[PDB]
Design a protein around this ligand. Sequence first.
Ligand SMILES: [Zn+2]
Ligand SMILES: [Zn+2]
Ligand SMILES: [Zn+2]
Ligand SMILES: [Zn+2]
Lengths: 584, 49, 133
Amino acid sequence: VGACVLCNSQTSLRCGACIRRPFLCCKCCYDHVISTSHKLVLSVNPYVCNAPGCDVTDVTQLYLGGMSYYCKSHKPPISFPLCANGQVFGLYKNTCVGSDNVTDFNAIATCDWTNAGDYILANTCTERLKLFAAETLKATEETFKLSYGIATVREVLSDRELHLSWEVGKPRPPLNRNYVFTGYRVTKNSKVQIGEYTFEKGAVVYRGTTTYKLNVGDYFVLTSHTVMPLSAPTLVPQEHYVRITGLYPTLNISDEFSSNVANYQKVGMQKSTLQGPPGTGKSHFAIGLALYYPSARIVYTACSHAAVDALCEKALKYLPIDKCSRIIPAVECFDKFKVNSTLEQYVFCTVNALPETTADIVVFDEISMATNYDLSVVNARLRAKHYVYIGDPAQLPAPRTLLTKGTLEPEYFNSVCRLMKTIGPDMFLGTCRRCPAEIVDTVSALVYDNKLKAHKDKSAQCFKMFYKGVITHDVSSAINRPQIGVVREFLTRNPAWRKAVFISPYNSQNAVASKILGLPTQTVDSSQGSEYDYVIFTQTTETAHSCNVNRFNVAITRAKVGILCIMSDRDLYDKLQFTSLEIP
Amino acid sequence: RDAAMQRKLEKMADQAMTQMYKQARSEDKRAKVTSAMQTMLFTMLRKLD
Amino acid sequence: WDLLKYDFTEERLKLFDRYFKYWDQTYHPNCVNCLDDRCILHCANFNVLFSTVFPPTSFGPLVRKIFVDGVPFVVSTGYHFRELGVVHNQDVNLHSSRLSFKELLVYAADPAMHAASGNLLLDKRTTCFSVAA
Ligand SMILES: [Zn+2]
Ligand SMILES: [Zn+2]
Ligand SMILES: [Zn+2]
Ligand SMILES: [Zn+2]
């Protein structure tokens, strides 16, 4: 028994063919079943023939006889079709509003999340259907993870390297950082987790969270977790205030956050979004908000543990250590604050582990990776006077494995990322401290509409090179060895660049470069939030993955001083306001 | 015929609605008692010394 | 006697050999091994006689700690009848994962947790054995 997702009318009918089984009123469920292949509807009891040994389950071919559901063949003389008169039989049939169109729900429910229009409609429907789409997408992802085959340790050559025998009849996952496995120990009659693992092509190179002496017999799977039904909206109803409500300004502020005073007062005058370009002081923004409002209790939330720990770092240099706490569910994270103190003034936790509690301000950092699922639970677990969304829509969101067709724009990353791409951001960091003048001017015109300003001058150590090379593909990545050879030739003539960090949009390209060049290697997706003095970037392809404007933003904005960019795409190479170099 | 084929189905439909009302009520009460029993066990365990 | 001792089979056999040596019919200290109803009665009579020598604190449910979801309970996994001797449960589930409605019904009914979580009682108004309040 629940509320119709389209109508809010009380109803006890839920679509049993859909993986989420959301509630649907009589008219809504009728239209949803007659328009698609979705025919299994669930009530307090299932709409399934009760005859012994019968399989008729379609909603339109059953009748209520006596106190049960029967097909036409096994029905008693006295029976009535539950599917008739433009409504489906169920509770509260008198109270029913219906909807003019169920096309959006039909599309979201019956899709497979392979088309870009699926995410577009997921982020552009009404709030309740946005929630439905988020839950359905997450459930589809978790189910798709189970379709992958189990890899078992068949041989242990050495440490940090392994041999995996894969299950027959099932596909193998793409081996990269986005697929975190989990080992299991073989016991007498059960299995025990032995930590979370990741694999890479070697023989396979494994980087597990916790080290061991793992031997033959242990196996790995992608751990799935139950997807819980969401009630709270992705965004609370926006209200703007004429004065400061429930908040009490501190009268002494240092020059560290004096630039943020105007933005701090804006937060306290409405129920707010911030777009923060790379190396601008996003944490520098957020921690001073605690200082600007010292009597306020603030919850710190983020999708991943690594980003959560980043917020814990800057609070250490500014905030009281007894007034903070790190919430950890029963990985190694920040372990200097007291653990699991919900009632403390400052709350540090991940989105998926947020406790049911209230606070004056809730700040959600690195809004880019967030999805509507993570947005809703924040509102469901936290009821706050002010909500601050801080991040950057021009940087990478969470990966969308199921998506193959089309490219995802920043407006569709989630409901928050929808806002600043149409109506603009409430606050913005217009001063970039990390990148030199060449890099910032390249990205300012690229995605920030020439609004990002340089703090550093031109470094004269930023170069670009156009080189197609040769593209080679393994099972789940791409390799461009000639581009790596160019880096090696560049390194010999410029030995000072051997302190640089190699970056590429492909894990396999990093692996080849790591052995050939000896530089530290990071993927663009994994490099968000980090800053390096020198970086060498190989695009390695001209695909949409490597040519993504958000990805090209993150890759080249990791440089403190200088960067070298070897381009395969002419478009991004011409957009680089860099010093062009010739191929040797 | 047809009027005696109709007004005797409104009784069975009403009976079906009441019966599945009752079954839903029972299924909610079951969840309530399950939660009560489990929380009682968990709160009396915490005195165990 | 030791407080933790609950199996007095050897003492029962010792007493039977001491006083009823030439009683031809066989004697089963634990009535779980008896052959039928008549043998159950026959051995329960001797257990009735022999159970008046052993301390009263050793008769009752035999409780045992089990782990579920990482949380330890203290649950009953047997019994020590004055008449029927020692009986052990066959379907004891150690290191379980979830408790269904049946298991929640079972664990909420036995006196194990209720007695183990309560405080000690000494009631001077009655001669009957008092376990807990
Ligand atoms: Zn409806
Ligand atoms: Zn459906
Ligand atoms: Zn049938
Ligand atoms: Zn016997």
